[PDB]
Structures are given as structure tokens and as C-alpha cells.
Design an enzyme around this catalytic site. Structure first.
Site, mmCIF file in Angstrom:
data_model
loop_
_atom_site.group_PDB
_atom_site.id
_atom_site.type_symbol
_atom_site.label_atom_id
_atom_site.label_comp_id
_atom_site.label_asym_id
_atom_site.label_seq_id
_atom_site.Cartn_x
_atom_site.Cartn_y
_atom_site.Cartn_z
ATOM 1 C CG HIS B 41 -0.669 0.217 2.454
ATOM 2 N ND1 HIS B 41 -0.764 -0.734 3.416
ATOM 3 C CD2 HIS B 41 -0.194 1.312 3.074
ATOM 4 C CE1 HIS B 41 -0.364 -0.243 4.557
ATOM 5 N NE2 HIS B 41 0.003 0.987 4.376
ATOM 6 N N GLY B 143 2.306 6.016 10.150
ATOM 7 C CA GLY B 143 3.673 5.828 9.724
ATOM 8 C C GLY B 143 4.330 4.570 10.242
ATOM 9 C CB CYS B 145 2.428 0.764 7.507
ATOM 10 S SG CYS B 145 0.755 1.071 7.945
#
Ligand SMILES: [Cl-]
EC number: 3.4.19.12
Lengths: 306, 306
Positions: B41, B143, B145
Site C-alpha cells: 500500500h 507511519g 506500517c
């Protein structure tokens, strides 16, 4: 979102852990520049620890009696000295992995990360609070002495704790890195009274703010209180007195949530007098006091380190 | 002694964290050998996440749109590909700090350490359990991820989790390092139901043994139970059924303490039905299910890592 008890990344400290052996005893030491720091009771046998004369014991030792091993690398000891309750062993090589560092003596109620080590090898990392009675509630098996506690500020490691002993009550005691014990404790195997412990009020308040930030809000009430009225309740419940300095430290969380500190005190007062009624806050059925206000801000902001 | 929720030392994983930037989104990546792994993503914009066609979106990208950064120094991306929900960015430099490692898919109820990272920089480390409904209750801000979860068996890092998303319920979901989600989740900003959760019964039992080993023992009672009558009660309180394999796994703790597994189940049965009556086991006023039997054994014999 979410809220967890979180330790600092332990990489910078891992590269400083060494094994120190003297005669029969092996424990952990901290290798920084060309000095290895470890608990002085590395020089004691079992019988010695009942009543050790550390000056006389150390006189029997020479540099070559100290075996210092960093991974598989053997360090050469070229000098030894005792500073309070820590042994300082000068070695002929500076640790190439020495981080930027400082030695700090922390205050009761402050938190730090512990790297538990055995035979110079890291086993795990977890967060600890220095209790108001200067003990800590850790996990320290036989051989863990010399494990250290630390905080990291970006790229600087602040070392604040070295583990020395377990009291007969199962709580843990140790020194700063200049070898001065936190609290009244001595490095000998006797019964030692720790003070009455108390709950760290400003930490409980900060954790209530974290709960509000994460959506746990059932405990907010219609009441307010005064610093003086609140402290009457605090003393009743073995809580540390709240001061204006504590109110000031909670200011940023007050502003983010829009809940005045004395309004949050009113909510804590009601939780102390009425209990929690089998409810939980942030997954806990007790009031948690091991998060400092700085811990809460770091985790509700995203503070990172080199 | 003492018992704590302990994470693995994170040093071996710290040296693998990099910052990955695609066009305008920035998250964390795992630099292993000459490959960087990150959530696919990263290639989405805000509006893209509502209904992404990842194959179409990836076609618009080439190797030079991916900015991979390790500290201050820069990797050259010479190839990219998508594996399920993970992006693999081939780089022309092997990570000199790559540990011995393995990719593993863990089972519900197993634990791992999470290194929470922001912008490629480690921020903290904590232990997590994979819930029976395949979510985790972490601490993950914007942030985070691409942060990863792992275990260490001596010198080998077994990566088991990469963080992908926060569900509208505030729980966290992610993939193994082959990009397959744990649970029914997808990398799309939509309402997603997680299943009913249950309590990990074999972990609660292991933690009760940890409590006995450490001196907390008021919960040991006069009674015993059968596996069947225990499961009748476990179903009532939404506990996972206990199987014979679970009894076998608890065997070593049974042998250390002299407390048969089924006697410890009788203690658990009385705790579910009667509560804790305002007493605490290992400092907790709730039954803890985030320690596996291997976690308990590891913290009572002092296992270290090299
Ligand atoms: Cl926690």
C-alpha cells in the site's frame, strides 16, 4: 492507536555487554570506551556475601584474575579499581561499538528499559519503574547481576541502573553507574528493609490521559477538586502527594485532551474511593503507575531514535 | 526471580529497518540481503486506499519511483515485484547487517516481539500475542506500517509479522513476510469485521505456573477437574477449548512444580467462576493470556541469544 508498555530498542546497549568472571563467579559487565563496569560482588564467594570486606577481598586480586569476554573476544585487563559498589576494569581495547552515552542518577517514579543478560549475552528487554522506595520489580534470575537499565534520547544512551541483588522479599535493588545504591541498600546477604512503597500519582494521572486519548472515557465525571483536597485522599490511599511541579508536567496532556489536571484528579479521586467496579482501563483492572508523562507523550506522538 | 512481559533484544532487527518512500507515502521496510520488503500500500494515495487495484497501480510505477533509505545512505532499486500484499524491492547492495533469518507463519496464540518503527527508525519494542481472531493489540501510530514482529532462537531471527493497517475498531492487522494476511483482512480502507475473540487457555495456564514458580500461590485450591468439565466452563467464559496437545505442552511446567495440569485447570475454573476477589496474580488483576508455555520456560531457565 493502542497503548503498550514499551522498551527502548536495545541494539546500542547490546553491543556493550560483556561477561566478567573472577574465580568462581560470573556475571555481566558494561564495556564503554576502554573501561568495563560491573558489580563489585564479582569478587565474592558464596560464604563471602554474608559479610564481605570488599577492600580486603579486592587486595587479593590482580588484573589477570579478571576474565573479561566480549562475544568470543577476550579482553586484556590492565587495571582495576573499586568505585563505591562497582568495579571498574581498565582494558587495553576501546569498545568500537561504544554509543554516545551519559551516566544519570534517576529520580523515584522515573522509568527505564532493562536489558536482562546472562553470561554477557542479552536475554530480553522490558520497561521498569524506580519505585518511591528505590526498588524495582524486575525479572532477574541467578547470573543477571550487572544487567543495566537505560533511556535513549535520539542517539544518546543514558545509563541509570545496574542490577546487584534480590532482597528476601523478591524485589530488586541496584546502583547507578558510579556504584551508589538507590535507596538504603548494601551489597551483602542480609535482611534489608525497603521503605513503605507508594503509588506514583503523576504517572497514574498521565496514564488516565492516555486512556482518554485512546477512547477509554467511562471514568470521567462531573466533579472537580483542589490540589489540597486531592492530597488528603492521596495520603489515605498511599499515593504520592501531587505538587504544582507535577501539574506543570501534565500540562501538554491537559491541552491535548482539554481536561484540566484538577478535573482528572477528581476522576482519580472517585476511582480511589469507589474502586473500578470490575471495569478496565486500557486493558487493566488496576490503576497503572509505571508510565511517566514523557512516556505517554512519546507514545501518543511517535518519538523515534537514531 | 520475578516475571515480566519481555521482548527479544531488538539489535539484529534494528539494522534491517529502512525508510521506503513511493511518490508521496513513507513507511518502513525490511532490508534483508539485497531485498527490501514493505507493505504494498506504499504505492497508494489517500483516495486510492478506498478501493485499490494494486496491479494497475503497480504498473504505473518503475524502479526509480521507490526511494529506499538506510540511515543517511541510499540504496539503488534495480527491480520490483509484488508478492501477495508485500512489495519486494530488489536493491544492488546486500545489507551487511543481515542476520541469520527465516520467514515463519505463526499460529493463533503464539507470541512475538514488535519493533515499532517510524520513518525507518526504531522507536520501541514490546511483546504481542496473535489473537485467536488473527488481530494483534499493538501500539501503532501513523507511519508505523512495515514494522515487523519476530522471534529469536539463539542466532536466528524468525520474522513472522509485518504491520499493515489499523482497523476502525482500533486493533491491528498484518501479514507474514510472504505477504499473506493473518485473518480475513485485506489492504483496503473499508469496514472489516474481525471474528469474535477468545482467551488463549493454554497461555493462561502457563502463566498460572509462572505465578507458582515465583511465589504467588493463593489460587491453588482443594479441587481437581476433568478435561471435559473444564471445557464446559471454558466455553461459557469464551476460553479456547483445552486439548490433549495443550496438556502435553504444559508437561514440563507440571513437572517442575509438582502440579498436574488438570489440578491447575481446577484452579483456573474457580478463578473464572469466582473472580480474583481483589487479589493480584503476578501484579495483574486479570487473567493474562499473552505468555506461551515456551515463554514461561524461557524466563525461568534464563535463555540467552547470540
Ligand atoms: Cl502492555
Amino acid at each position: 492507536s493502542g497503548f503498550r508498555k514499551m522498551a527502548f530498542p536495545s541494539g546500542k546497549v547490546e553491543g556493550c555487554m560483556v561477561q566478567v568472571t573472577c574465580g568462581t563467579t560470573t556475571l555481566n559487565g558494561l564495556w564503554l570506551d576502554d573501561v568495563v563496569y560491573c558489580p563489585r560482588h564479582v569478587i565474592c564467594t558464596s560464604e563471602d556475601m554474608l559479610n564481605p570486606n570488599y577492600e580486603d577481598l579486592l587486595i587479593r586480586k590482580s588484573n589477570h584474575n579478571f576474565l573479561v569476554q566480549a562475544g568470543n573476544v577476550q579482553l586484556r585487563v590492565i587495571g582495576h579499581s573499586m568505585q563505591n559498589c562497582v568495579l571498574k576494569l581498565k582494558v587495553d581495547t576501546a569498545n568500537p561499538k561504544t554509543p554516545k552515552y551519559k551516566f544519570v542518577r534517576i529520580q523515584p517514579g522515573q522509568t527505564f528499559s532493562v536489558l536482562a543478560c546472562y553470561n554477557g549475552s542479552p536475554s530480553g528487554v522490558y520497561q521498569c519503574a524506580m519505585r518511591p522506595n528505590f526498588t524495582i520489580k524486575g525479572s532477574f534470575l541467578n547470573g543477571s547481576c550487572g544487567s543495566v537499565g537505560f533511556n535513549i534520547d535520539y542517539d544518546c544512551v543514558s545509563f541509570c541502573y545496574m542490577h546487584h541483588m534480590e532482597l528476601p522479599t523478591g524485589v530488586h535493588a541496584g546502583t547507578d553507574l558510579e556504584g551508589n545504591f538507590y535507596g538504603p541498600f548494601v551489597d551483602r546477604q542480609t535482611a534489608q528493609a525497603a521503605g513503605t512503597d507508594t503509588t506514583i500519582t503523576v504517572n497514574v494521572l498521565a496514564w488516565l490521559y492516555a486512556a482518554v486519548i485512546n477512547g477509554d472515557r467511562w471514568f470521567l465525571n462531573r466533579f472537580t477538586t483542589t490540589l489540597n483536597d486531592f492530597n488528603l485522599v492521596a495520603m489515605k490511599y498511599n499515593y504520592e502527594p501531587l505538587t504544582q511541579d507535577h501539574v506543570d508536567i501534565l500540562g501538554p496532556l491537559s491541552a491535548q485532551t482539554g481536561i484540566a489536571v484538577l478535573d482528572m484528579c477528581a476522576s482519580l479521586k472517585e476511582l480511589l474511593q469507589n474502586g473500578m467496579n470490575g471495569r478496565t482501563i486500557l486493558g487493566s483492572a488496576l490503576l497503572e503507575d509505571e508510565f511517566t508523562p514523557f512516556d505517554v507523550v512519546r507514545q501518543c506522538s511517535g518519538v523515534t531514535f537514531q
